[PDB]
Symmetry: C3
Subunit: 148 residues, 3 copies
């Protein structure tokens, strides 16, 4: 697992925010795109993304994450959102990945959960593989937008 | 964390599917058993398992996973399902585990989520322990069926 | 990742329960505080905490977890709860953390999920950082109570 000072040197995080740097992870921020109730949302334009109660939202990360072939992305919801009743349905960030992440966030609470554009909401930890993956990732690769 | 080429040599995955092999994990597939709305389902016979909207399903993995005493199973939903609004409630795969996994998948969306028999739905990563666990797992062990 | 025998020597777990020790993790137990339906609950006094169907609860862990600057806390719901339809919305346990954890647990089932005071419900795994985090955690730090 990469500590904070090693995250700067191993993972390409654009744009990078020093405040998003955690002791052993990086706080991914809300990007320009979102998907709530079957509608695409321009979080960059609208400025926010509101996850209605008991609804899930596909949120595009502001950061474009590029993982080396020997690093795995382990994402967890920011504790703030968890304490708000928000559940994150995160998959692995395969070694070699490159592009903005489409993160599923479910508002299990009865109050709407508002997420400002560029606000930190998911801390991604980076676990180093024992060796570079024989076959780096090649699926939703190079995604710069919300991918379904 | 075991890369793809090391997963072949350290973890017993039966049946094994080369397509389920990920850069740093293995895509567990839907097995023969499932549990939705208080009913047992024969996904092998019925061929599919449908998680109704806002309902959770206990799904038996097609693969029988046997973990060495120094490897921990880290499971995450397949991004495809996450983008569908499906949330996985996965526990740790203790070092030493052996048997098919009962995976809780919650359909947080408003559309039914269909999972074919043998379809990949959960990628399990394998983290190597600093040393073999003093007491390997002995609880729902050797489970070859859905375990409640 | 710390095996069971290394968890005793690296992580400060108070109070510690040998039964909560897993092959590669520790089963965190339900503490004295809980938060369900906008109300604070005295699980120590009341003895239990009931997560109503389709509701989430903020549960304070009985154990006060103190992580070294080079260890990350990876929490997952206990398989028992997962098989019950309970989903855990857990964030990272930053290296250096010290204090009781506020764990979000969502009852996705249609039956109430009862959690006795001191009952194990979340197994926390400990991943060692490649090096001590440059900036250990300093946010909801030293939390001995439910923190929102
Ligand atoms: O919530 C997620 C999780 C992963 N990814 C990215 C990183 C991965 O390379 C890929 C998902 O494939 P898996 O690693 O989950 O198999 O897409 C996302 O965009 N959103
Ligand atoms: O979603 C899961 C997670 C784990 N297991 C298996 C592997 C573990 O050995 C055991 C669960 O015990 P814990 O590791 O969660 O404590 O059952 C499952 O069947 N389904
Ligand atoms: O579910 C959780 C997860 C984490 N923490 C603690 C440990 C962390 O130090 C901090 C949350 O900050 P992050 O690590 O999630 O960024 O609070 C909790 O109390 N509950």
């Amino acid at each position: 697992l990469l500590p904070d000072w090693k995250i700067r040197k191993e993972i390409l995080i654009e744009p990078f925010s020093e405040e998003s740097l955690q002791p052993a992870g990086y706080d991914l921020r809300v990007g320009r795109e979102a998907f709530v109730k079957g509608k695409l949302i321009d979080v960059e334009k609208e400025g926010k993304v509101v996850i209605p109660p008991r609804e899930y939202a596909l949120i595009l990360t502001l950061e474009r994450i590029k993982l080396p072939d020997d690093v795995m992305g382990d994402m967890k919801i920011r504790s703030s959102l968890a304490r708000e009743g928000v559940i994150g349905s995160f998959a692995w960030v395969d070694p070699g990945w490159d592009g903005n992440l489409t993160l599923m966030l479910y508002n299990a609470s009865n109050e709407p959960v508002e997420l400002r554009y560029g606000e930190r909401f998911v801390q991604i930890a980076f676990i180093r593989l024992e060796g570079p993956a024989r076959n780096p990732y090649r699926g939703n690769y190079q995604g710069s937008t919300r991918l379904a």
